[PDB]
Design a protein around this ligand. Structure first.
Ligand code: A1B1E
Ligand code: ZN
Length: 139
């Protein structure tokens, strides 16, 4: 679990969105595994606006933050899970690291701010849904 809190927005994995998220919906995209809902209180996270390929992510199944090198956002084939069939997920970045079911939502960040959140795992790989192109999160 986990979210990004920027401005009056909450960014979560679409597959983990709650009823309150759907009832206060701003934007959602199944192909990216992202959903954004509106919040009453202002958040403290800032979004990175950069081309970094190195950063640090939070892994809840280890209680640890790990430094990683990650690929540029791309269209990647992801295996069937309880939440989606096997399909192509867009705007996804991969790295080598631990990610098991429950780690979705952990933040990946670089020197400029939040880059994205954990969205996929297994086999010693972790995938992150990028948010750096969503410029509207800053206004
Ligand atoms: C977070 O890791 C899970 C994962 O990749 N999922 C399930 C949750 C939905 C993910 C997606 N974005 O399509 C895929 C996972 C699965 C299967 C095995 N190990 C780990
Ligand atoms: Zn950066």
């Amino acid at each position: 679990s986990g979210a990004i809190y920027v401005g009056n927005y909450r960014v979560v994995n679409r597959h983990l969105a709650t009823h309150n998220d759907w009832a206060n919906l701003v934007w959602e995209d199944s192909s990216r595994d992202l959903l954004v809902s509106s919040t009453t209180a202002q958040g403290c996270d800032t979004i990175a606006r950069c081309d970094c390929q190195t950063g640090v992510y939070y892994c809840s199944s280890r209680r640890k933050h790990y430094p990683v090198s990650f690929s540029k956002p791309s269209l990647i084939f992801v295996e069937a899970s309880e939440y989606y069939p096997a399909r192509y997920q867009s705007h996804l970045m991969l790295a080598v690291g631990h990610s098991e079911p429950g780690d979705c939502g952990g933040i990946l960040r670089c020197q400029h701010g939040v880059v994205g959140i954990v969205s996929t795992g297994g086999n010693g790989l972790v995938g992150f849904a990028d948010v750096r192109d969503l410029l509207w999160l800053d206004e």
